[PDB]
Amino acid sequence: DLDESWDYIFETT
Amino acid sequence: PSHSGAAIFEKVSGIIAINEDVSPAELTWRSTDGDKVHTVVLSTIDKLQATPASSEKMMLRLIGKVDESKKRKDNEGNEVVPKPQRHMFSFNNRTVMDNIKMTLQQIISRYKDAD
């Protein structure tokens, strides 16, 4: 389960 | 060899090449080995975002423009039916990955203000 997290790594900083 | 950088798309090691010959330009991506290649216009992009330098995993992200013509976001709540485009690429260097983002910011900033 690392798909959703992929958006966070790019969403925020 | 003008405007290019090591860009890994879909877990594939390849090199990217930006083409500023035309208005909307064009970003080509060919596999390092030679078999898989994809082409995506940069003009389609709307916003630019990437991971911090502190992040062990150096990667960039590109967000496309939204469809504010057919889609509707209610009046007080936002009822969006579709979703915006978002593509990310895996890099192996902060310098190279930074050269791409820095460029994409100028390409869109020049085509977004000019109209």
Curated annotation (Swiss-Prot), chain A:
Subunit architecture: Interacts with human SMARCB1/INI1, presumably generating an open chromatin conformation at the EBNA2-responsive target genes. Interacts with human WAPL. Interacts with host CBF1; this interaction allows transcriptional activation by EBNA2. Interacts with host general transcription factors GTF2B, ERCC2 and ERCC3. Interacts (via PXLXP motif) with host ZMYND11/BS69 (via MYND-type zinc finger). Interacts with host EBF1.
Residue runs in coiled coils: none
Subcellular location: Host nucleus matrix
Family: Belongs to the herpesviridae EBNA2 family.
Protein name: Epstein-Barr nuclear antigen 2
Entry's transmembrane regions: none
Lineage: Viruses, Duplodnaviria, Heunggongvirae, Peploviricota, Herviviricetes
PTM text: Phosphorylated.
Top-rank taxon, per record: Viruses
Residues included from the entire protein: 453 to 465 of 487
UniProt source species: Epstein-Barr virus (strain B95-8) (HHV-4)
Function comment: Plays a key role in the activation of the host resting B-cell and stimulation of B-cell proliferation. Acts by up-regulating the expression of viral EBNA1-6, LMP1, LMP2A and LMP2B genes, as well as several host genes including CD21, CD23 and MYC. Activates transcription by acting as an adapter molecule that binds to cellular sequence-specific DNA-binding proteins such as host CBF1, SMARCB1 and SPI1.
Swiss-Prot record, chain B:
Record field: compositional bias (Basic and acidic residues): 65-76
Coiled-coil segments on the chain, per record: none
Domain of life: Eukaryota
Positions of transmembrane segments: none
Region (Disordered): 65-85
Subcellular location: Nucleus
Disulfide bridges in this chain: none
Miscellaneous field: Present with 5150 molecules/cell in log phase SD medium.
Function per UniProt: Component of the general transcription and DNA repair factor IIH (TFIIH) core complex, which is involved in general and transcription-coupled nucleotide excision repair (NER) of damaged DNA and, when complexed to TFIIK, in RNA transcription by RNA polymerase II. In NER, TFIIH acts by opening DNA around the lesion to allow the excision of the damaged oligonucleotide and its replacement by a new DNA fragment. In transcription, TFIIH has an essential role in transcription initiation.
Subunit field text: Component of the 7-subunit TFIIH core complex composed of XPB/SSL2, XPD/RAD3, SSL1, TFB1, TFB2, TFB4 and TFB5, which is active in NER. The core complex associates with the 3-subunit CTD-kinase module TFIIK composed of CCL1, KIN28 and TFB3 to form the 10-subunit holoenzyme (holo-TFIIH) active in transcription. An additionnal subunit, TFB6, plays a role in the dissociation of the SSL2 helicase from TFIIH after transcription initiation. TFB1 interacts with XPC/RAD4. XPC/RAD4 recruits TFIIH to the NER machinery. Interacts with the NER 3'-endonuclease XPG/RAD2.
Family per similarity comment: Belongs to the TFB1 family.
Descriptive protein name: General transcription and DNA repair factor IIH subunit TFB1
Species of the source: Saccharomyces cerevisiae (strain ATCC 204508 / S288c)
Included range, full protein: 1 to 115 of 642
